């Protein structure tokens, strides 16, 4: 694994250079999915040293900046809608299984347990490209906050919800519900406890006179909450650190006054390496030869179902919210990408079932298809408002 | 392994507490490492998993800040004096081998090639505690910049030199060329990436994109370390140290925004050097197969400790007087032993079943020298 890491960096200068050079083009690392892969089709196994378990420990730093960048402009404005969109994860899962179940059934003119697994897997929605486009336009703040809040909550629900399905074993349905509620409640309680401990430590003790000591303690205490989840056996490790929203609510504002900018720059740099996760999408598309061995003709069943499922649970959910404004226009815009986190779930143990491989293959084509919406976003923005 | 890192953080949290309490204490974090091991001793192998190759990849962030923190106030006034201490690593190894050679021969009442490894390894000296004292007191700026000079340079020299004599087996001539060739190639390739970084930020306008140039600087600097290892050029730690020219040119050209961020970001990882400071007791209490020897050869090495830092600086610095120094800084150079020398002793730590004595001996050296470092303010007032 000597020069394997070098290839990750070497291509990344090109990714950095693409953003600066192609700043005004019609339309960064996602472009290399087609051209770059074929040249190396002939080190392939080593470029695959990528360990799934270690993929779920470099993601929490990505999640932390998402929860550390809240502007507190939606806690009393659109928080209720976001909490209403917590049921969207259940809504997407129960509707995706509605159509995809008939998909492979009509293929033969195998169990239902993995059908639920795919539905909960696809529920993640992280339109980072759309959010970046909205931010640079510095417009529609109401849509900016509401969409961003929905994007960081469903994936947190998705990771917790899919685990209970994987351990479903009959009745025993309430056992899976208890595991879902227990893990999610435990993740929030213990995860926020470390943030509270960090907040109270810097609220009374006059440690703010040492900018590095508070900076180092802040990173260690925040990372300890994520680490403690695996030690105690409580799963949802991604959701544990995501609950550090209260960390930016109390610890940031209490007495820092110097590391306020330092915390962002140190942590956004970790989030600035999100192209590595972006690069990993195409990496498993060709390097992991066995992963995409099937590429079966089940795409059309998932292609039609993945958009109609989102279509049939955005307006009805917003219709209920409208009973108790919203411009009646934002629901069309809502339908963005299909989740950055989503890829990691499809690579869980990678061969548990014969169809476990083809879920990743279907997900790979999703990333190669839905990303055109990110490019066709400026035109869509001016189309409506 | 999931909960192994968790126990490292809690003891690392207490390090911040110790440095918080010590504003006026007579005086270090070196205490909790010993205390933590006793609790677990009275989980063992899992705590000290610590892959040997993985120690050399968490080390470069420590070296990078040292080369990036230069005040550019020494290359014009004491550059020659500091470069004269490039032979100090060899000069220390010239006399350390002599005493250690008689240490086991007289005790016996292996071969001398192992003495070379111990002498080259011992030449490292990074008295980070000494620099912290001078900075807080804000005194002796000439002494502060001179001490920082050889302290960080010889660490790279020790790592590159010990490899040549480790494979050395007349045959001594090409070992020097191997040592010189790697060191020469480290400066070329190591500064090659720095030149590329410098020219990119001076011609193309990256000043308007501060969110992007910070990643570019980190990626290019890191790639210098990765390229050296992959290409087969050893002394990869020295290769990243050859990026000292980034602070000379890249840091000053057109950043104007990330100047502070680049310093803080890399210095933040250097603040995580307590893990290196804490990996001693992790291996000094839990690795029962490693440190169980603790042979009665410490006195032979301990006598070599003081004379190594005396038989060289007093003669060599006398030569520099030919072309003041007040004769107080002359004796002050006998500082600490640093923290980089640990990794050279753990190079798979299994060359021979009985030769692992050097790993045992080095661990006691850190404890013995640390208490000497604690009583540094007393020597500061006695001399100056």
Residue numbers in the entry:
A (entry chain B): 23 to 49, 54 to 68, 123 to 189, 199 to 259, 269 to 422, 428 to 488
B (entry chain A): 23 to 49, 54 to 68, 123 to 189, 199 to 258, 269 to 422, 428 to 488
Would you copy out the relevant sentences from the publication that reported this structure?
Na+/H+ exchangers (NHEs) are ancient membrane‐bound nanomachines that work to regulate intracellular pH, sodium levels and cell volume. The NHE9 monomer consists of 13 TMs with an extracellular N‐terminus and intracellular C‐terminus.
Superimposition of NHE9* (wheat) and NHE9 ΔCTD (core transport domains (blue), dimerization domains (orange), linker helices (grey)) structures, which show only small differences in the most mobile regions. Cryo‐EM density map of the NHE9 ΔCTD homodimer with the 6‐TM core transport domains (coloured in blue), the dimer domain (coloured in orange) and the linker helix (coloured in grey).
